[PDB]
Amino acid sequence: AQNPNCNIMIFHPTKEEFNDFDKYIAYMESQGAHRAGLAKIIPPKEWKARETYDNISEILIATPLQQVASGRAGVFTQYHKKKKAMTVGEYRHLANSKKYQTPPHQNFEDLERKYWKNRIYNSPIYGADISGSLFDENTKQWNLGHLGTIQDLLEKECGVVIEGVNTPYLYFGMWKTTFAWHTEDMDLYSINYLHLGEPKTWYVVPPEHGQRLERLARELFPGSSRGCGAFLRHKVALISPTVLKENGIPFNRITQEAGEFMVTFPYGYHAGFNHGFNCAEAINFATPRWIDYGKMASQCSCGEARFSMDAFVRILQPERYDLWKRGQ
Numbered sequence: 350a351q352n353p354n355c356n357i358m359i360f361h362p363t364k365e366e367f368n369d370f371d372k373y374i375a376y377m378e379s380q381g382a383h384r385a386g387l388a389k390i391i392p393p394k395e396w397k398a399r400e401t402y403d404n405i406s407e408i409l410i411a412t413p414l415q416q417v418a419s420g421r422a423g424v425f426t427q428y429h430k431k432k433k434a435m436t437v438g439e440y441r442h443l444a445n446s447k448k449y450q451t452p453p454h455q456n457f458e459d460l461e462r463k464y465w466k467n468r469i470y471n472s473p474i475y476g477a478d479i480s481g482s483l484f485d486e487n488t489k490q491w492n493l494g495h496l497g498t499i500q501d502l503l504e505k506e507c508g509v510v511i512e513g514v515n516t517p518y519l520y521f522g523m524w525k526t527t528f529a530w531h532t533e534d535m536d537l538y539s540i541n542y543l544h545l546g547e548p549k550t551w552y553v554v555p556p557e558h559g560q561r562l563e564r565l566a567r568e569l570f571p572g573s574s575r576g577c578g579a580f581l582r583h584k585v586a587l588i589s590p591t592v593l594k595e596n597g598i599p600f601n602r603i604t605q606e607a608g609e610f611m612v613t614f615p616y617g618y619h620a621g622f623n624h625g626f627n628c629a630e631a632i633n634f635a636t637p638r639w640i641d642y643g644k645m646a647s648q649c650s651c652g653e654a655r656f657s658m659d660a661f662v663r664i665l666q667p668e669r670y671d672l673w674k675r676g677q
Protein backbone atom coordinates (compact mmCIF):
# COMPACT_ATOMS: atom_id res chain seq x y z
CA ALA A 350 0.00 0.00 0.00
CA GLN A 351 1.41 3.38 -1.07
CA ASN A 352 1.37 6.33 1.37
CA PRO A 353 0.15 4.29 4.40
CA ASN A 354 0.68 7.22 6.83
CA CYS A 355 -1.63 9.33 4.56
CA ASN A 356 0.90 12.18 4.20
CA ILE A 357 0.12 15.14 1.95
CA MET A 358 2.26 14.63 -1.16
CA ILE A 359 3.82 17.36 -3.31
CA PHE A 360 4.28 16.80 -7.06
CA HIS A 361 6.58 18.48 -9.61
CA PRO A 362 5.36 17.47 -13.06
CA THR A 363 7.54 18.09 -16.10
CA LYS A 364 5.90 20.04 -18.94
CA GLU A 365 5.55 16.68 -20.73
CA GLU A 366 3.75 15.17 -17.71
CA PHE A 367 1.57 18.30 -17.42
CA ASN A 368 0.02 17.61 -20.84
CA ASP A 369 -2.55 14.96 -19.84
CA PHE A 370 -4.61 15.92 -16.78
CA ASP A 371 -6.39 12.58 -16.24
CA LYS A 372 -3.14 10.65 -16.70
CA TYR A 373 -1.33 12.68 -14.02
CA ILE A 374 -4.18 12.49 -11.50
CA ALA A 375 -4.08 8.70 -12.02
CA TYR A 376 -0.28 8.76 -11.56
CA MET A 377 -0.58 10.72 -8.32
CA GLU A 378 -3.06 8.13 -7.06
CA SER A 379 -0.72 5.27 -8.10
CA GLN A 380 1.68 6.80 -5.53
CA GLY A 381 -1.08 6.88 -2.86
CA ALA A 382 -1.61 10.67 -2.99
CA HIS A 383 -5.37 10.33 -2.50
CA ARG A 384 -4.95 8.67 0.89
CA ALA A 385 -4.05 12.08 2.39
CA GLY A 386 -7.26 13.62 0.98
CA LEU A 387 -5.22 16.52 -0.44
CA ALA A 388 -2.19 16.93 -2.73
CA LYS A 389 -0.06 19.87 -3.90
CA ILE A 390 0.97 20.16 -7.54
CA ILE A 391 3.76 22.58 -8.46
CA PRO A 392 3.47 23.41 -12.18
CA PRO A 393 6.43 23.23 -14.58
CA LYS A 394 8.64 26.34 -14.51
CA GLU A 395 7.67 27.22 -18.12
CA TRP A 396 3.91 27.12 -17.44
CA LYS A 397 1.69 30.10 -16.61
CA ALA A 398 -2.06 30.61 -15.95
CA ARG A 399 -2.16 33.96 -17.78
CA GLU A 400 0.21 36.77 -18.81
CA THR A 401 -0.42 39.24 -15.94
CA TYR A 402 -2.91 40.04 -13.18
CA ASP A 403 -2.78 43.77 -13.95
CA ASN A 404 -6.27 43.91 -15.45
CA ILE A 405 -8.52 42.25 -12.80
CA SER A 406 -9.60 45.28 -10.72
CA GLU A 407 -12.94 45.72 -12.55
CA ILE A 408 -14.20 42.22 -11.73
CA LEU A 409 -17.36 42.59 -9.61
CA ILE A 410 -17.91 40.82 -6.31
CA ALA A 411 -21.71 41.08 -6.43
CA THR A 412 -22.28 39.77 -2.88
CA PRO A 413 -19.27 39.97 -0.55
CA LEU A 414 -19.85 37.81 2.55
CA GLN A 415 -18.90 38.94 6.04
CA GLN A 416 -17.94 35.82 8.01
CA VAL A 417 -19.34 36.14 11.53
CA ALA A 418 -18.28 33.55 14.12
CA SER A 419 -20.04 32.09 17.17
CA GLY A 420 -18.60 29.67 19.76
CA ARG A 421 -15.11 29.39 21.23
CA ALA A 422 -11.71 30.07 19.64
CA GLY A 423 -10.99 26.42 18.69
CA VAL A 424 -14.60 25.32 18.08
CA PHE A 425 -16.93 27.75 16.32
CA THR A 426 -19.54 28.10 13.62
CA GLN A 427 -19.58 30.95 11.12
CA TYR A 428 -22.51 32.46 9.25
CA HIS A 429 -22.35 34.72 6.21
CA LYS A 430 -23.78 38.20 6.28
CA LYS A 431 -24.36 39.69 2.83
CA LYS A 432 -22.65 43.02 2.08
CA LYS A 433 -23.06 45.51 -0.76
CA ALA A 434 -21.31 44.89 -4.09
CA MET A 435 -17.73 46.00 -4.65
CA THR A 436 -15.10 45.59 -7.36
CA VAL A 437 -11.97 43.51 -6.85
CA GLY A 438 -10.07 46.83 -6.77
CA GLU A 439 -12.22 48.04 -3.86
CA TYR A 440 -11.99 44.63 -2.14
CA ARG A 441 -8.18 44.63 -2.42
CA HIS A 442 -8.06 48.10 -0.85
CA LEU A 443 -10.35 46.93 1.97
CA ALA A 444 -8.25 43.79 2.55
CA ASN A 445 -5.14 46.01 2.86
CA SER A 446 -6.72 48.54 5.26
CA LYS A 447 -5.73 48.71 8.93
CA LYS A 448 -8.95 46.95 9.98
CA TYR A 449 -8.44 43.86 7.81
CA GLN A 450 -4.70 43.63 6.94
CA THR A 451 -2.49 40.69 7.89
CA PRO A 452 -0.81 41.48 11.23
CA PRO A 453 2.95 41.47 11.81
CA HIS A 454 4.17 37.90 12.23
CA GLN A 455 7.40 35.94 12.28
CA ASN A 456 6.39 33.08 9.92
CA PHE A 457 3.55 30.76 8.75
CA GLU A 458 3.52 29.07 12.19
CA ASP A 459 3.12 32.38 14.05
CA LEU A 460 0.33 33.39 11.66
CA GLU A 461 -1.48 30.07 12.24
CA ARG A 462 -1.24 30.61 16.01
CA LYS A 463 -2.68 34.13 15.60
CA TYR A 464 -5.50 32.86 13.39
CA TRP A 465 -6.76 30.25 15.88
CA LYS A 466 -6.28 32.52 18.87
CA ASN A 467 -7.99 35.57 17.34
CA ARG A 468 -10.22 34.54 14.37
CA ILE A 469 -13.55 34.58 16.24
CA TYR A 470 -13.10 38.20 17.45
CA ASN A 471 -13.08 39.61 13.90
CA SER A 472 -15.41 39.25 10.94
CA PRO A 473 -13.48 39.27 7.66
CA ILE A 474 -15.20 39.73 4.30
CA TYR A 475 -14.90 37.03 1.63
CA GLY A 476 -15.56 37.23 -2.11
CA ALA A 477 -16.52 33.58 -2.61
CA ASP A 478 -18.21 31.49 -5.31
CA ILE A 479 -17.95 34.00 -8.14
CA SER A 480 -18.60 32.23 -11.46
CA GLY A 481 -15.68 32.92 -13.82
CA SER A 482 -12.05 32.19 -14.70
CA LEU A 483 -8.67 33.95 -14.76
CA PHE A 484 -7.02 31.34 -17.00
CA ASP A 485 -6.07 32.63 -20.41
CA GLU A 486 -7.90 30.87 -23.25
CA ASN A 487 -4.47 30.08 -24.74
CA THR A 488 -3.35 28.17 -21.62
CA LYS A 489 -3.62 24.58 -22.85
CA GLN A 490 -2.47 22.64 -19.76
CA TRP A 491 -4.38 22.46 -16.45
CA ASN A 492 -6.78 25.21 -17.47
CA LEU A 493 -9.57 24.83 -14.90
CA GLY A 494 -12.19 26.07 -17.40
CA HIS A 495 -11.19 23.44 -20.00
CA LEU A 496 -11.36 20.29 -17.91
CA GLY A 497 -13.61 17.36 -18.80
CA THR A 498 -17.06 17.87 -17.27
CA ILE A 499 -18.45 15.71 -14.47
CA GLN A 500 -21.56 15.12 -16.61
CA ASP A 501 -19.39 13.67 -19.41
CA LEU A 502 -17.48 11.48 -16.92
CA LEU A 503 -20.75 10.13 -15.48
CA GLU A 504 -21.97 9.47 -19.03
CA LYS A 505 -18.73 7.69 -19.98
CA GLU A 506 -18.83 5.45 -16.87
CA CYS A 507 -22.58 4.85 -16.47
CA GLY A 508 -23.77 5.17 -20.09
CA VAL A 509 -26.41 7.79 -19.29
CA VAL A 510 -26.51 11.31 -20.77
CA ILE A 511 -27.49 13.95 -18.19
CA GLU A 512 -28.25 17.66 -18.10
CA GLY A 513 -25.94 20.13 -16.41
CA VAL A 514 -22.72 22.07 -16.81
CA ASN A 515 -19.88 22.67 -14.39
CA THR A 516 -17.75 25.79 -14.56
CA PRO A 517 -15.03 27.33 -12.39
CA TYR A 518 -15.46 29.76 -9.51
CA LEU A 519 -13.26 32.58 -8.21
CA TYR A 520 -12.51 33.25 -4.53
CA PHE A 521 -11.17 36.63 -3.41
CA GLY A 522 -9.78 36.34 0.11
CA MET A 523 -8.32 38.48 2.87
CA TRP A 524 -6.65 37.78 6.24
CA LYS A 525 -8.75 35.40 8.39
CA THR A 526 -11.24 34.52 5.63
CA THR A 527 -12.18 30.93 6.38
CA PHE A 528 -13.44 27.81 4.66
CA ALA A 529 -15.27 25.50 7.06
CA TRP A 530 -14.85 21.72 7.36
CA HIS A 531 -16.43 19.94 4.41
CA THR A 532 -16.13 17.48 1.59
CA GLU A 533 -17.18 18.42 -1.94
CA ASP A 534 -20.75 18.09 -3.22
CA MET A 535 -21.39 14.37 -3.95
CA ASP A 536 -17.86 13.82 -2.53
CA LEU A 537 -16.32 14.97 -5.81
CA TYR A 538 -12.71 15.95 -6.35
CA SER A 539 -11.80 19.61 -6.43
CA ILE A 540 -8.85 21.42 -7.93
CA ASN A 541 -7.79 24.84 -6.65
CA TYR A 542 -5.25 27.22 -8.21
CA LEU A 543 -3.92 30.18 -6.23
CA HIS A 544 -3.59 32.87 -8.89
CA LEU A 545 -2.14 35.66 -6.85
CA GLY A 546 -1.46 37.17 -3.45
CA GLU A 547 -0.90 35.76 0.00
CA PRO A 548 -0.99 32.07 0.94
CA LYS A 549 -3.84 29.74 1.91
CA THR A 550 -3.37 27.23 4.74
CA TRP A 551 -5.20 23.91 4.42
CA TYR A 552 -6.18 21.23 6.89
CA VAL A 553 -7.30 17.78 5.77
CA VAL A 554 -8.49 14.45 7.19
CA PRO A 555 -7.65 11.23 5.28
CA PRO A 556 -10.79 9.86 3.48
CA GLU A 557 -10.41 6.51 5.29
CA HIS A 558 -10.88 8.41 8.61
CA GLY A 559 -13.62 10.85 7.55
CA GLN A 560 -16.25 9.27 9.82
CA ARG A 561 -14.02 10.05 12.84
CA LEU A 562 -14.25 13.77 12.06
CA GLU A 563 -18.02 13.48 11.58
CA ARG A 564 -18.36 11.77 14.98
CA LEU A 565 -16.37 14.54 16.68
CA ALA A 566 -18.34 17.23 14.84
CA ARG A 567 -21.62 15.73 16.11
CA GLU A 568 -20.23 15.91 19.66
CA LEU A 569 -18.88 19.47 19.29
CA PHE A 570 -21.93 20.91 17.47
CA PRO A 571 -24.86 19.04 19.11
CA GLY A 572 -27.57 21.51 18.02
CA SER A 573 -26.51 21.63 14.36
CA SER A 574 -26.18 17.82 14.35
CA ARG A 575 -29.77 17.28 15.56
CA GLY A 576 -31.02 19.65 12.85
CA CYS A 577 -29.35 17.75 9.99
CA GLY A 578 -27.79 14.32 9.45
CA ALA A 579 -25.04 15.83 7.27
CA PHE A 580 -24.73 19.35 8.73
CA LEU A 581 -21.06 19.67 7.69
CA ARG A 582 -22.63 20.07 4.21
CA HIS A 583 -23.76 23.52 5.46
CA LYS A 584 -20.08 24.48 5.53
CA VAL A 585 -20.24 26.34 8.86
CA ALA A 586 -18.18 24.27 11.35
CA LEU A 587 -14.59 25.07 12.33
CA ILE A 588 -12.45 22.88 14.61
CA SER A 589 -8.82 23.84 15.31
CA PRO A 590 -5.81 21.53 14.91
CA THR A 591 -5.28 21.69 18.70
CA VAL A 592 -8.82 20.37 19.27
CA LEU A 593 -8.44 17.70 16.56
CA LYS A 594 -5.19 16.61 18.24
CA GLU A 595 -6.88 16.49 21.68
CA ASN A 596 -9.52 14.17 20.21
CA GLY A 597 -7.10 11.93 18.29
CA ILE A 598 -8.42 12.87 14.83
CA PRO A 599 -5.86 12.07 12.14
CA PHE A 600 -5.15 15.11 9.96
CA ASN A 601 -2.47 17.03 8.07
CA ARG A 602 -1.78 20.68 7.26
CA ILE A 603 -0.06 22.41 4.35
CA THR A 604 0.24 25.98 3.09
CA GLN A 605 -0.47 26.76 -0.58
CA GLU A 606 1.30 29.71 -2.18
CA ALA A 607 0.59 31.68 -5.35
CA GLY A 608 1.24 29.67 -8.53
CA GLU A 609 0.46 26.28 -6.95
CA PHE A 610 -2.40 23.82 -7.44
CA MET A 611 -4.15 21.86 -4.71
CA VAL A 612 -6.32 18.82 -5.44
CA THR A 613 -8.79 17.47 -2.88
CA PHE A 614 -9.83 13.84 -3.29
CA PRO A 615 -13.22 12.17 -2.82
CA TYR A 616 -14.44 12.29 0.78
CA GLY A 617 -11.36 14.22 1.99
CA TYR A 618 -12.66 16.62 4.65
CA HIS A 619 -10.84 19.96 4.47
CA ALA A 620 -10.81 23.45 5.93
CA GLY A 621 -8.50 26.43 6.08
CA PHE A 622 -7.88 30.14 5.98
CA ASN A 623 -6.29 32.89 3.88
CA HIS A 624 -3.17 34.78 5.02
CA GLY A 625 -4.05 38.03 3.26
CA PHE A 626 -5.42 39.43 0.02
CA ASN A 627 -5.47 36.67 -2.59
CA CYS A 628 -7.41 35.18 -5.51
CA ALA A 629 -8.00 31.48 -6.06
CA GLU A 630 -9.92 29.62 -8.76
CA ALA A 631 -11.54 26.24 -8.15
CA ILE A 632 -13.77 23.67 -9.84
CA ASN A 633 -15.02 20.16 -9.07
CA PHE A 634 -14.05 17.23 -11.31
CA ALA A 635 -14.52 13.45 -11.43
CA THR A 636 -12.58 10.34 -12.44
CA PRO A 637 -13.75 6.73 -12.78
CA ARG A 638 -12.65 6.17 -9.14
CA TRP A 639 -15.07 8.87 -7.94
CA ILE A 640 -18.22 6.99 -8.99
CA ASP A 641 -18.33 4.66 -5.95
CA TYR A 642 -17.89 7.67 -3.63
CA GLY A 643 -20.68 9.52 -5.44
CA LYS A 644 -22.93 6.52 -4.75
CA MET A 645 -22.23 6.72 -0.99
CA ALA A 646 -22.13 10.49 -0.50
CA SER A 647 -24.27 11.84 2.37
CA GLN A 648 -26.88 14.47 1.47
CA CYS A 649 -28.28 17.49 3.27
CA SER A 650 -32.09 17.18 3.05
CA CYS A 651 -32.92 19.85 5.68
CA GLY A 652 -32.79 22.69 3.11
CA GLU A 653 -29.77 24.60 4.48
CA ALA A 654 -27.08 23.33 2.07
CA ARG A 655 -26.69 25.29 -1.19
CA PHE A 656 -28.39 22.66 -10.09
CA SER A 657 -26.00 20.09 -11.53
CA MET A 658 -26.45 18.10 -8.29
CA ASP A 659 -29.96 16.90 -9.25
CA ALA A 660 -28.77 14.48 -11.93
CA PHE A 661 -25.96 13.03 -9.81
CA VAL A 662 -28.37 12.21 -6.95
CA ARG A 663 -31.03 11.03 -9.44
CA ILE A 664 -28.71 8.51 -11.15
CA LEU A 665 -26.26 7.50 -8.41
CA GLN A 666 -28.68 7.62 -5.43
CA PRO A 667 -32.20 6.95 -6.78
CA GLU A 668 -33.44 5.78 -3.36
CA ARG A 669 -32.43 9.10 -1.74
CA TYR A 670 -33.68 11.30 -4.60
CA ASP A 671 -37.31 11.97 -3.54
CA LEU A 672 -36.53 13.00 0.06
CA TRP A 673 -33.50 15.02 -1.09
CA LYS A 674 -35.64 16.83 -3.65
CA ARG A 675 -38.15 17.83 -0.93
CA GLY A 676 -35.35 19.53 1.01
CA GLN A 677 -34.47 21.59 -2.07
Ligand SMILES: O=c1[nH]cnc2cnccc12
Binds near residue numbers: 477520527528549619
Ligand atom coordinates in the same frame (compact mmCIF):
# COMPACT_ATOMS: atom_id res chain seq x y z
O1 LIG B 1 -10.32 28.60 -0.88
C1 LIG B 1 -11.49 28.27 -0.64
N1 LIG B 1 -12.49 29.22 -0.42
C2 LIG B 1 -13.77 28.87 -0.17
N2 LIG B 1 -14.19 27.66 -0.09
C3 LIG B 1 -13.28 26.62 -0.28
C4 LIG B 1 -13.71 25.31 -0.20
N3 LIG B 1 -12.90 24.26 -0.37
C5 LIG B 1 -11.61 24.51 -0.63
C6 LIG B 1 -11.08 25.78 -0.74
C7 LIG B 1 -11.93 26.86 -0.56
Ligand SMILES: [Co+2]
Binds near residue numbers: 531619
Ligand atom coordinates in the same frame (compact mmCIF):
# COMPACT_ATOMS: atom_id res chain seq x y z
CO1 LIG C 1 -13.72 22.31 -0.90
Ligand SMILES: [Zn+2]
Binds near residue numbers: 577579580583650651
Ligand atom coordinates in the same frame (compact mmCIF):
# COMPACT_ATOMS: atom_id res chain seq x y z
ZN1 LIG D 1 -28.80 20.18 6.21
